[PDB]
């Protein structure tokens with residue numbers, strides 16, 4: 001029993017489009033208007049984040065066709081830099097990165113779905129936490145049931161969020177067509193543009209939050225049918241669509257609201273809904289909830305496969321990377337992902353763990369590209385279906401290095417505790433991997449709890 | 465394989481009865497715990513308090529109004545036309561005012577009734593094309609224009625000694641002209657010289673609302689007594705009435721508290737306007753140490769604050785001689801007052817005061833920013849409570865938004881606060897520690913939580929503390 005090969009091209013487009021378009025297009029625009037001062041600089045920030053993500057994803061497309069194995073961005077560091085830094089990337093991805101980005105989007109789903117019951121109010125926070133946990137547990141059950149069901153869910157909710165954004169787009173177009181064009185006249189357009197890269201960088205960080213997940217199809221390769229045509233085709237179809245929809249949606253936001261409205265607001269989407277429909281204005285936050293539901297599904301689907309592939313290499317315990325027969329789904333990895341996500345419901349505010357750790361994210365992203373360039377020279381024994389032009393990785397590495405170095409500058413005490421946490425995985429590594437010839441007291445207990453979990457979930461190892 | 469069993473060995477051992485029972489029992493336990501969490505979320509939602517409906521506000525509920533009596537003295541000599549006013553809307557947008565009461569501009573000769581036409585603009589201000597350019601120029605800056613219409617604004621008696629009949633029937637025809645010209649409201653002043661004035665105001669209020677519900681009518685008296693004011697508002701309930709009911713006094717704050725609370729009691733907490741007169745400045749009634757304390761009070765009471773031009777800089781007719789007390793010159797720059805070239809200073813102009821963060825105009829801007837933005841200052845609820853000998857202390861709270869607590873010391877000797885409320889409802893009881901937004905006098909730190917049993921106040925100080933909706 002191995003996993004399968006049943007993800008087609010449209011399923012890959014759905015995975016990428018649905019996982020990228022989550023909550024950032026409804027939450028972050030205040031954060032980029034606040035710290036870039038002007039509508040003009042804000043819209044340029046959105047376009048700059050767009051082209052940055054496009055360049056990085058093309059580098060990942062040729063990376064993923066070179067080393068065509070699952071668990072991307074961890075398999076690529078394991079191929080180049082070896083066991084220990086790959087374990088450090090896996091340990092931070094397992095403990096912080098994945099089960100915070102899932103829980104944030106689940107919480108946004110809950111609040112924007114309960115918003116039509118408490119219009120001019122804060123929604124009660126315990127009900128929001130409970131509905132978020134319900135979302136996560138239900139999508140875990142659907143993913144444990146079958147792989148085709150999860151892809152059908154992804155298709156439906158990707159289509160739903162695309163129609164929901166096309167509505168907000170053409171409403172702001174017909175607002176222009178009514179001929180009362182208050183903002184976006186090409187004379188004002190730019191006042192308040194401050195200067196001082198030291199704060200616009202932080203604005204850039206907010207924009208990059210809306211582009212997270214541009215490399216998740218790399219994590220879920222080895223499930224694709226013909227992943228030599230289909231993976232670069234899926235990336236190159238998926239991302240220009242996303243950056244186009246993002247700049248048009250920010251424009252349609254700017255056609256209706258004034259600037260200090262958008263700085264003083266807590267939800268730009270419900271303002272757009274109230275202004276333009278009034279009655280039947282409960283439509284917009286329902287569709288925001290549907291968006292966040294779809295992206296939580298996509299992130300669970302890729303995180304399970306990452307922890308699967310990490311268990312096959314001997315970095316994680318052996319009960320992960322066991323497949324349940326018949327069903328043919330990696331059940332204990334999905335259970336582990338769900339539990340790690342639900343543990344973040346004890347956070348008072350986890351939207352501040354971002355900017356504690358973005359430097360490590362872009363560090364490993366740039367390290368994979370450096371390793372790709374090194375592998376282009378010190379291994380010309382590989383076949384490359386797409387060999388991208390060089391200096392596109394060089395400029396991408398320079399941009400990532402710029403981002404890291406300016407993160408160390410403005411907030412060094414932010415990056416310090418992040419460095420302590422990312423080296424806190426080192427005793428874990430030595431205790432787990434380096435200590436073969438373990439004491440005999442522990443091997444029997446590990447075998448016992450592994451065979452107990454197997455007898456519970458009915459999962460067998462991978463072999464065929 | 466690696467640290468566990470293989471395929472056929474497990475399918476041998478993990479297929480026995482009892483293990484199948486344990487698996488189905490765990491599946492049923494999962495799907496029951498999920499429904500338990502769903503029911504818990506539902507009973508948390510339906511046991512929550514609903515929120516109040518917003519009171520469907522108008523445009524004159526949002527911020528302050530700005531009265532420009534004399535046009536020729538607002539800019540200066542020569543450029544005292546309606547076209548010159550168009551260059552000042554960026555300053556009025558800096559003040560965040562929402563309205564603009566332009567002075568009477570129509571063709572009025574003198575006590576000759578027959579040569580007074582309320583439909584023709586006097587040539588000294590411009591003509592109609594300048595006016596309707598000004599209207600849309602203000603409209604694009606989101607500033608409404610209210611047009612004063614007092615007929616005899618050059619003579620002594622403002623309402624034409626002669627019978628009011630002809631006068632009052634030409635005022636009626638003026639409204640239906642200037643409304644479809646495009647103005648947003650009207651103001652009639654000095655209605656104590658109008659015989660049976662209570663009956664004429666209802667007809668004009670009918671006509672003004674019979675055009676749109678986004679229209680305003682302001683009336684002005686010089687009456688400072690409560691019973692004569694209440695007789696104007698017996699049939700009219702949506703009339704803004706400015707009067708000198710507040711000015712007259714101000715030596716002690718327990719007399720100001722009684723005035724405000726008696727006015728709100730006698731009218732049943734309806735929407736009102738707060739002023740010190742119908743056309744004068746603040747400095748015509750107050751000494752110059754009390755101008756910050758009154759600007760803190762007028763921006764936090766439940767109504768619409770109305771100011772004249774120059775109350776944001778503390779303009780004074782008794783500081784520059786050889787000048788009318790009814791139309792002083794607005795001190796824009798140092799060169800603004802030509803005669804006696806050197807009597808002005810730097811702290812007396814808008815150009816000089818736009819830098820100093822402890823100036824009067826710097827206080828006006830922050831207060832007019834807070835008033836048009838926060839909900840509990842927009843349509844909140846008012847509750848005054850008892851305090852020390854000379855204090856005026858009250859609280860504004862809407863539903864669940866951030867409450868506000870204003871403490872004013874009208875006295876001269878400094879004193880402790882003694883904020884013993886004990887009568888405020890439980891939705892608005894004050895905590896032990898509250899923030900601080902501003903103070904009228906410098907020498908405090910804006911932002912740190914200060915605690916409300918050792919709160920002391922210096923001479924003529926006011927405080928704008930803050931706390932959120934909690935237990």
Ligand SMILES: CCCCCCCCCCCCCCCCCC(=O)OC[C@H](COP(=O)(O)O)OC(=O)CCCCCCCCCCCCCCCCC
Nearest residue numbers: 315316317318319332335336339428431432433449453467
């Ligand atoms: C959370 C429950 C999900 C259900 C699936 C069970 C998964 C349990 C394993 C969780 C792994 C946690 C991350 C470990 C990070 C270190 C990895 C490493 O160093 O290499 C491993 C290394 C690989 O050795 P190998 O498995 O012999 O190849 O093995 C170990 O060193 C194991 C020691 C760490 C185990 C810590 C487990 C703490 C959580 C236990 C949760 C309960 C499990 C039993 C449930 C049923 C009880 C009735």
Ligand SMILES: CC(C)CCC[C@H](C)[C@H]1CC[C@H]2[C@H]3CC=C4C[C@@H](OC(=O)CCC(=O)O)CC[C@@]4(C)[C@@H]3CC[C@@]12C
Nearest residue numbers: 138139142145146147148149150151152153154290293
């Ligand atoms: C917010 C509401 C409107 C939608 C939330 C999702 C639904 C509540 C749940 C309930 C049942 C779930 C799924 C249950 C099983 C499948 C069957 C599936 O078809 C299959 O059986 C293919 C799998 C196979 O047989 O191999 C198509 C729909 C789907 C995803 C269902 C779609 C809807 C799901 C994810």
Ligand SMILES: CC(C)CCC[C@H](C)[C@H]1CC[C@H]2[C@H]3CC=C4C[C@@H](OC(=O)CCC(=O)O)CC[C@@]4(C)[C@@H]3CC[C@@]12C
Nearest residue numbers: 144324326327331335456457458487488490491492494
């Ligand atoms: C509750 C958590 C913390 C502990 C982990 C227990 C598992 C989540 C439970 C829930 C349902 C259980 C199992 C019930 C029996 C099997 C066989 C399977 O039987 C079939 O339907 C075979 C399908 C076919 O015939 O084609 C049904 C689901 C499955 C994988 C389940 C896998 C997961 C189990 C062990």
Ligand SMILES: *[C@@H]1O[C@H](CO)[C@@H](O[C@@H]2O[C@H](CO)[C@@H](O)[C@H](O)[C@H]2NC(C)=O)[C@H](O)[C@H]1NC(C)=O
Nearest residue numbers: 663665666667668669670671672673674675699
């Ligand atoms: C406009 O004014 C007229 C008369 O001033 C109002 O009509 C009547 O007013 C008297 C009070 O003086 C009421 O007793 C009658 O019931 C009114 N007639 C009605 C309502 O048909 C009239 O209400 C005013 N217009 C508006 C819109 O209120």
Ligand SMILES: *[C@@H]1O[C@H](CO)[C@@H](O[C@@H]2O[C@H](CO)[C@@H](O)[C@H](O)[C@H]2NC(C)=O)[C@H](O)[C@H]1NC(C)=O
Nearest residue numbers: 620621622654656657685686687688689692708
């Ligand atoms: C409002 O101002 C007038 C002008 O000083 C005050 O005096 C009245 O003046 C008119 C004509 O000028 C007379 O017909 C009245 O008889 C005067 N009033 C009295 C009481 O004699 C008027 O008193 C002022 N109003 C108040 C309430 O003080």
Ligand SMILES: *[C@@H]1O[C@H](CO)[C@@H](O[C@@H]2O[C@H](CO)[C@@H](O)[C@H](O)[C@H]2NC(C)=O)[C@H](O)[C@H]1NC(C)=O
Nearest residue numbers: 690694724725726727728729730731732733887
């Ligand atoms: C102002 O409001 C107070 C209540 O807050 C009124 O005081 C009460 O009036 C009724 C009848 O007049 C008395 O039976 C109560 O004993 C009064 N209570 C208190 C605490 O004084 C007061 O009447 C209102 N003012 C006016 C003019 O009606």
Ligand SMILES: *[C@@H]1O[C@H](CO)[C@@H](O[C@@H]2O[C@H](CO)[C@@H](O)[C@H](O)[C@H]2NC(C)=O)[C@H](O)[C@H]1NC(C)=O
Nearest residue numbers: 752777778779780783808809810811812813816
């Ligand atoms: C503008 O600033 C000058 C200089 O500080 C003020 O002149 C002071 O006035 C106060 C009382 O008015 C005196 O106690 C000081 O001794 C004066 N100092 C000097 C150097 O002249 C002037 O009053 C200020 N103008 C206003 C309107 O506040």
Ligand SMILES: N[C@@]1(C(=O)O)CCc2ccc(OCc3ccccc3-c3ccccc3)cc2C1
Nearest residue numbers: 020022023024100101208209210212213354357
């Ligand atoms: N686009 C999403 C939306 O909600 O709009 C939807 C899905 C998704 C998936 C992965 C992801 O990566 C996380 C990340 C990305 C960029 C910058 C910092 C972080 C970060 C760093 C530390 C801890 C948590 C997050 C972000 C997002 C946001």
